[PDB]
Amino acid sequence: MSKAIQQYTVDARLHAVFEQSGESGKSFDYSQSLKTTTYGSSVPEQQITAYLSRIQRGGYIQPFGCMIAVDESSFRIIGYSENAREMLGILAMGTDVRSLFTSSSSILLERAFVAREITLLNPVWIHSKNTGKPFYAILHRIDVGVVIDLEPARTEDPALSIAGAVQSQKLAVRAISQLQALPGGDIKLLCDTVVESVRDLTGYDRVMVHKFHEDEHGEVVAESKRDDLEPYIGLHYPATDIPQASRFLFKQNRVRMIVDCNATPVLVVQDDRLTQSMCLVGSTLRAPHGCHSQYMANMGSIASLAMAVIINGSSMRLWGLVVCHHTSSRCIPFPLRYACEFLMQAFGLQLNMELQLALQMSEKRVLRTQTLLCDMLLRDSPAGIVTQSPSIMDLVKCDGAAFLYHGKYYPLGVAPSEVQIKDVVEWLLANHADSTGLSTDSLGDAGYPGAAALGDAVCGMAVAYITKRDFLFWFRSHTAKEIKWGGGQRMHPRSSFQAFLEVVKSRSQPWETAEMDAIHSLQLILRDSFKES
Amino acid sequence: GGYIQPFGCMIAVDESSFRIIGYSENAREMLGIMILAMGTDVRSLFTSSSSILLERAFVAREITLLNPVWIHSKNTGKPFYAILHRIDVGVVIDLEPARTEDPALSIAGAVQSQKLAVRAISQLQALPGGDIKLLCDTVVESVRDLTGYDRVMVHKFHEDEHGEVVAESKRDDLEPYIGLHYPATDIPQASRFLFKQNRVRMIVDCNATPVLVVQDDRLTQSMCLVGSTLRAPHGCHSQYMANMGSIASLAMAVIINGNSMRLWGLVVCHHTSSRCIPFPLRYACEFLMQAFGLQLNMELQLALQMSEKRVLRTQTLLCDMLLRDSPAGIVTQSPSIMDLVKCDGAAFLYHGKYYPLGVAPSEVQIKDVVEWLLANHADSTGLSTDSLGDAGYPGAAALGDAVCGMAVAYITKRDFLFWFRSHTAKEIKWGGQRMHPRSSFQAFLEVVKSRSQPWETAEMDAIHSLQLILRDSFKES
Amino acid sequence: RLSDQEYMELVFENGQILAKGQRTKSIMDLYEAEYNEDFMKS
Ligand SMILES: *[C@@H](C)[C@H]1/C(=C/c2[nH]c(/C=C3N=C(/C=C4\NC(=O)C(C=C)=C4C)C(C)=C\3CCC(=O)O)c(CCC(=O)O)c2C)NC(=O)[C@@H]1C
Ligand SMILES: *[C@@H](C)[C@H]1/C(=C/c2[nH]c(/C=C3N=C(/C=C4\NC(=O)C(C=C)=C4C)C(C)=C\3CCC(=O)O)c(CCC(=O)O)c2C)NC(=O)[C@@H]1C
């Protein structure tokens, strides 16, 4: 289950609340809706089904291109967008599509249609029969036929179209070469370079790198913007600001573009014999939902372009996103979007390399520290692991540490007092004298009566047992300590930041598996050493 | 006045005045003229839009960002792909006929050159990320599918700079070449230098008659056609290809980070008959090469780190074993000094007692080697060599093919640690004068006749670390 | 074997979020076949 699967119900409920607020004619309440709607509980299956159908079978497209859906065997039209006639300069249910374009273009379309498992005419460059207007035709297959997306192209000499494609691809190659030469072992430098390269390539006003955490919430880790804009670097926001369905879609359409959020969507008309509404999952012209369009309008961004960052985890994993914003309407041609996809693949490869190297370095460091601690223990008393230079404060990342041995209490850093720790010990023995140790992200959630007394200094605790009355403790304070962004009912980044600092109010950062394994290993070593005495 | 392959054309023009200064002898026939002559303005040979594009390319700083240009011939109206580069005298333009004349199909193919590369690289992304052989095999299959050649191979270069064939895909009726080693002189240093600056080499027909390039008689030296893509092959390599049976060839470079970049190897393609592939597929391959280089570098770094972890673990176990028992116990249990490094055998000399493991000399032979070492290498802490003959060991360096390389670490003055490697040919297997792969394989086994594989820096460091720990332990004793 | 991308759809079945779905020549041979310009001579 986890949050990835638990978040679907929450997303559906937020969607239903937004729809009801829209129907009743009232504004949407963000903070109240987030507080009321919390993970868990249940929901009828019909709500999930309706939510998914609404997201994937919306029935609307953006008004910067046309869409026509045709039957595979007959080439007869089974659906079209309401703006098709105006753009083609002219359709009906049953009309033959080959009659809408010139004869050579219809031959090329037939060739593209008859291919098997791969085709080298996708997209095709076609002309309209009545006017001779050039279009990029992009084809994909749905459970009832073939959908053609028609994107207008600039009228010019073909040599110039080829030149534009060439220039875009060469810029992408140069950017990848610049990535090659960075000195490794520094993810922050990698992101700082990629953001600038993408901004230079695409030309948007703001470019940001978003990273997703194990808790599914997002962080802005790099930024490149126009001078007169405010910075968003350092921001954290909840996990429900990007639903799970859009994340799933990002693993198939690696680039998403929204040209104008204020533009009026265009309805798609379809043959009345089709049982369901036409699927628009693979289409590039799909329109965004009202929630996100309103969020964009409030923020002040009119055009948007998002690209998935995918790493290897056999199975692939979504690490984050690259997000671009513009203060006015903006559209980019198809070759440039494929250049951006190429650069994102290079970035993903480098990122995966860096992550694995960092893991190895951490393992090495932990092993060395453990060996030094054991050597120190053998040449000294039991208290030789808290009084020397290396100490249990270096085994894992923590705010404080403590050693309780034969009634003696040795603290380091931010740790409870000798009176409070006694109470913690009584609570552990009364409730948790059935294990070798434990780890908790928040003492309040665990159920420690004195959690409020400790305050924000001590929120998370890892305890390792040595014997019936000797313990090792590691302590962490609350998350807000390490989070600094220099900046309630309206959907806006500030509302998101305030809503984030309401679920981590009495929580620390989670304990990773590597840190717990290191703690357990040192625990076994010390257990044997003290048992031998 | 060099030579170029007949499948294209070449014109060299002054940068400042656009006046032609040199050209290939086949230029007039290709351009449809048969005017072209010294001092003629190049723009007059092409349409107006072609001249505009050419001027734009000429006025750019990074001229490599406007390549390839699409132009049309003024007389006949056929399309050409032009590739421009700079030299000391002016600008060299390589003109190649385009096999597709319809503009719509031209644009479609230009877009496919990107889509195909993306779809190919998505298959490298999906690899687990811990195996170099699997990566090489996947790249071989992808390149073969894209280009369709008869044979596709991956060549890896060594520290000695000799080559090995590590992966290959071919027809069923051709003889395999996987496992072949050949000398380092089969690829001169100039070729390796050029494979970094210009990452592709193509030869359409080795038997084709070259075409002379004429130049202005006012120039003080011949033009530098080294960077041109139409340059003709050498006699040595042309004859080599003819003997081997290869008419067409395509070679691409593999680049990694060096210490400045390093040429790791090559991807080499062979066809039994003449072949010239269209531009979209060439660029689809050229884009995949960069992703291949990235992933290869990642794999090398990870393997290095895992090796370090392994050596440390083994050293720790050996030190524990030393603490538990006498030093002899180092060479009695399953972990032993043979697992510290890659070797054929090992030996421990301790107070005149001999402990051999695996393939090692005899006790009398070991005494002879110790005598030689003290006579000539007493003032040292140890050493390593890949051939006792080259080192000069007089006492029957001919210990056989079994013992050729030796690494020695001193302990105090009489206790020694030895690691032994046999001759290289032990680890080389291939199923298989006139320049031919068999001749190259036989010539390789004349420089490694009694030589072992070289001792690496990391293995030397591991041996030094173990030596230091043992020396401290014996200091305590 | 290179291929065209296939698109999937999320559905809710039996309490589960499931995803549902909807060459003997080389690439060079296809390129030669599909980019033939003979029809343009008519
Ligand atoms: C309303 C139902 C909830 C919600 C829905 C929602 N969100 C997206 C997609 C995105 N929202 C993003 C979030 C942010 N944008 C920012 O810049 C910041 C912070 C600075 C936030 C919080 C982003 C980014 C995306 C993805 C990019 C994209 O353009 O797709 C969607 C889907 C959009 C679509 O394309 O259909 C939906 C339905 N957002 C909310 O705020 C509430 C909780
Ligand atoms: C004759 C002087 C020596 C020599 C010279 C030479 N070699 C190259 C380039 C290549 N030769 C290659 C060698 C091999 N090709 C194979 O497939 C195998 C084994 C199966 C071998 C040994 C290869 C590969 C290259 C690089 C690729 C390329 O096509 O360039 C050159 C440069 C020629 C040019 O392109 O101008 C020269 C001068 N080759 C010999 O084998 C002998 C000893």
CA-proximal residue: ligand 1, atom 25 (nearest): A242
Residues A401 and A453 in one domain: yes
Residue nearest (by alpha carbon) to ligand 1 atom 34: A288
Ligand 1 atom with the shortest distance to the CA of A237: 22
CA-to-CA distance for A240 and A7, rounded, in angstroms? Answer: 7
Q: Collect all residues with Cβ–Cβ distance below 8 Å to A431 and sequence separation of at least 6.
A: A447
- Window B:345-404, CB contacts with A under 8 Å: none
Q: C7 and A282 in contact by Cβ < 8 A?
A: yes
Indicate which CATH number applies to the domain containing A491.
3.30.450.270
Residue type, C41: K
A136 to chain B: nearest residue by CA? B108
Mutate to test the pocket of ligand 2, among B240, B246, B270 (most ligand atoms within 8 A of CB): B240
Sign of torsion, CA B110 B114 B119 B120?
A: positive
Cβ(A277)–Cβ(A59) below 8 Å: yes
Residue A432 is given by DSSP the state H
3-state DSSP helix/strand/coil percent for chain A, to nearest 5?
40, 20, 35
Start-to-end C-alpha separation, chain C: 36
Residues in chain C: 42
Query: What total of structural domains would you count in chain B?
Result: 3
B233 touches ligand 2 (CB under 6 Å): yes
- Measured CA to CA, the distance from residue B21 to residue B8 in angstroms comes to 18
Same domain, yes or no, for A357 and A451?
no
Contact indicator for A376, A388 with CB cutoff of 8 Å: yes
- Report the residue numbers after which chain B has a gap, meaning the C atom sits over 2.5 angstroms from the next written residue's N, or none: 34, 259, 432
Sign of the C-alpha dihedral computed for residues A190, A193, A196 and A200 taken in this order: negative
Within 10 angstroms of residue A386's Cβ, the number of other Cβ atoms is 17
Contacts of B272 (CB under 8 A, 6+ apart): B150, B245, B246, B247
Cross-chain residue pair B145–C37, CB shorter than 8 Å: no
Buried b (16+ CB within 10 A) or exposed e, B85-111: eeeebbbbbbbbebebebbbbbbbbbb
Residue B284 domain-assigned? yes
Residue B222 lies in a domain: no
Residue B224, in any domain of the structure: no
C-alpha A137: how far from chain center? 30
Q: Which of B78, B98, B118 is the last residue of a domain?
A: B98
What does the DSSP 8-state code read for residue A114? T
Choose the final residue of a domain: B98, B117, B145: B98
**A353 plus A384 within the same structural domain:** no
Q: Helix (H) and strand (E) counts for chain C?
A: 1, 2
* Domain shared by A463 and A330, yes or no: no
Q: Is the CB of B125 less than 8 angstroms away from the CB of A167?
A: no
Which other chains touch chain A, taking contact as 3+ CB pairs less than 8 Å apart? B, C
A183 to each of A178, A179, A198, A375, B363, how far by Cα in Å? 11, 9, 20, 35, 51
* Nearest by CB: B102 against C2, C5, C40: C40
- Asked if residue B1 lies in contact with residue B214, where contact means CB atoms within 8 angstroms, the answer is yes
Where does B218-358 have alpha helices with state H? 235-244, 279-324
Report yes or no on B318 lying in a domain.
Answer: no
Domain match, A428 and A514 both: yes
Q: Return the DSSP state at A289.
A: P
Dump the DSSP string for A443-469: HHHHT-TTHHHHTTS--EEEEEESSSS
Nearest to B354 by CA among B339, B368, B340: B368
Name all residues whose Cβ lies below 6 A of ligand 1: A 14-15, 18, 232, 235, 237, 240-243, 246, 256, 258, 288-289, 291-292, 295, 304, 306, 323, 491, 493, 496
**Using CA of residue C24, residue C27, residue C33, residue C34, what is the dihedral sign?**
positive
DSSP B71: E
CA-wise closest residue to A521 among A369, A410, A415: A369
Are B202 and B225 in contact by the 8 Å Cβ rule? The answer is no
User: Two tokens at A511?
Assistant: 């304990």
- Distances, alpha carbon A137 to alpha carbons A21, A40, A92, B294, in Å: 39, 45, 20, 34
SS3 state of residue C4: coil
Query: In this structure, are B3 and B23 located in the same domain?
Result: yes
User: Domain for residue A273, yes or no?
Assistant: no
At a CB cut-off of 8 Å and minimum separation 6, what does A507 contact? A441, A442, A445, A459, A460, A478, A479
Query: In terms of residue numbers, what domain contains B117?
Result: 99-205+247-306
Beta strand ranges found along B272-427 (DSSP E) = 345-350, 353-358, 382-385, 405-410, 416-421
Residue B441 Cβ contacting ligand 2 at under 6 Å: no
- Are the C-beta atoms of residues B146 and B317 closer than 8 Å to each other? no
**Nearest C-alpha in C relative to B119:** C2
**A66 assigned binding-site residue:** no
Asked whether B21 and B12 are in contact (CB, 8 A), the reply is yes
Which protein residue's CA is at the shortest distance from atom 41 of ligand 2? B186
Contact indicator for B288, B143 with CB cutoff of 8 Å? yes
| Residue entry with tokens 């090992």 | B346
- End position of a domain, from candidates B98, B114, B133: B98
Q: Rounded distance, CA B379 to CA B247, Å?
A: 59
CA distance A496 to C15: 31
Alpha-carbon span A111 to A126, nearest angstrom = 13
Nearest CA to A397 out of A420, A365, A368, A443 is that of A365
- For chain A, the straight-line distance linking the first and the last C-alpha, in angstroms and rounded, comes to 45
Residue A220 lies in a domain: yes
| Residues A281, C7 contacting (CB under 8 angstroms) | yes
Using an 8 Å Cβ cutoff, are B7 and B205 in contact? yes
Same domain, A180 and A319: yes
Residue A102 maps to a domain: no
- Let me know if residue A287 belongs to a domain: no
Greatest Cα pair distance, chain A, in angstroms, is: 95
Nearest of A267, A264, A331 to residue A293 by alpha carbon? A264
Chain A touched by B48 (CB under 8 Å):
no
Q: How far is the CA of B297 from the centre of ligand 2 (A)?
A: 26
Q: Which two tokens stand for residue A73?
A: 């065997």
Do both B445 and B337 map to the same domain? Answer: yes
Residue A140: half-sphere exposure toward Cβ, Cα within 13 Å: 19
Task: Please list the residues that pair with B23 across neighbouring strands.
Answer: B11, B214
How many other C-beta atoms can be found within 10 angstroms of the C-beta atom of residue B434? 9
The residue assigned the tokens 């928040």 is A442
Tokens found for residue C26: 């080389």
Q: Which chain C residues have a beta carbon less than 8 Å from that of B280?
A: 31
Same-domain check for residues B50 and B164: no
- Same domain? For B427 and B372 the reply is yes
How many angstroms separate the CA atoms of A421 and A438, rounded? Answer: 16
Residue whose CB lies within 8 A of the most ligand 1 atoms, among A36, A246, A497, for a mutation test: A246
In this structure, the answer to whether residues B283 and B200 fall within a common structural domain is: yes
H helical segments located in B150-274: 189-197, 235-244
The answer to whether residues A253 and A320 belong to one domain is: yes
Separation CA B38–CA B218 (nearest Å): 11
CATH of the domain at A334: 3.30.450.40
The CB of B438 under 6 Å from ligand 2? The reply is no
Q: Which residues contact B185 (CB under 8 A, 6 or more apart)?
A: none
How was this structure determined? It was done by cryo-EM
CB of B38 closer than 8 Å to CB of B45 = no
Identify any residues that bridge with A207 across adjacent strands, giving them in sequence order. Answer: A224, A324
